[PDB]
Amino acid sequence: AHKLFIGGLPNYLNDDQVKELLTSFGPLKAFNLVKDSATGLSKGYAFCEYVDINVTDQAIAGLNGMQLGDKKLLVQRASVGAKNA
C-alpha cells in the first residue's frame, strides 16, 4: 500500500536485476533505482511498489534484516513523511 525502499543494493545491478529481486514475491506496480552514476558516486538504494498491499509486507519479511558483508540491507516500507503519530 506504499513505496518500499531498498537501501542494500550492491552496484553491479541494473533494472531487471534489482527488479527480479523485489519481484520474487510478486509483480510490482512501480519500480525505480537510486545511484549517482553521474559524477562517480553510488547512493546504493532504490524504490518499488507492489500491486497488492499484503505482498509488500511479505517482501519485508523475506528481506528486511539481510546483512551482506560490510553493510546492512535497509529494506523496509518507504512511506513516512507523516506527522500523525
Side-chain angles (χ1 to χ4, degrees):
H2 263 301
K3 306 150 63 151
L4 298 169
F5 158 98
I6 288 81
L9 300 172
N11 57 98
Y12 48 73
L13 299 174
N14 39 28
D15 188 66
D16 271 71
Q17 285 176 123
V18 179
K19 172 153 153 216
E20 167 138 311
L21 296 160
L22 300 163
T23 227
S24 229
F25 286 93
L28 311 139
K29 173 157 191 207
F31 185 45
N32 173 62
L33 301 130
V34 200
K35 39 193 196 147
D36 201 34
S37 300
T39 323
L41 245 135
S42 68
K43 297 269 161 195
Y45 68 78
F47 286 104
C48 66
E49 321 181 33
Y50 284 125
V51 180
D52 201 20
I53 292 71
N54 172 52
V55 171
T56 279
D57 245 298
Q58 193 175 203
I60 300 189
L63 292 167
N64 175 227
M66 179 154 198
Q67 190 264 348
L68 183 78
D70 202 298
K71 319 179 65 117
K72 176 173 241 152
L73 281 274
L74 304 212
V75 187
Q76 47 190 293
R77 280 150 76 179
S79 156
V80 38
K83 314 133 290 272
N84 267 231

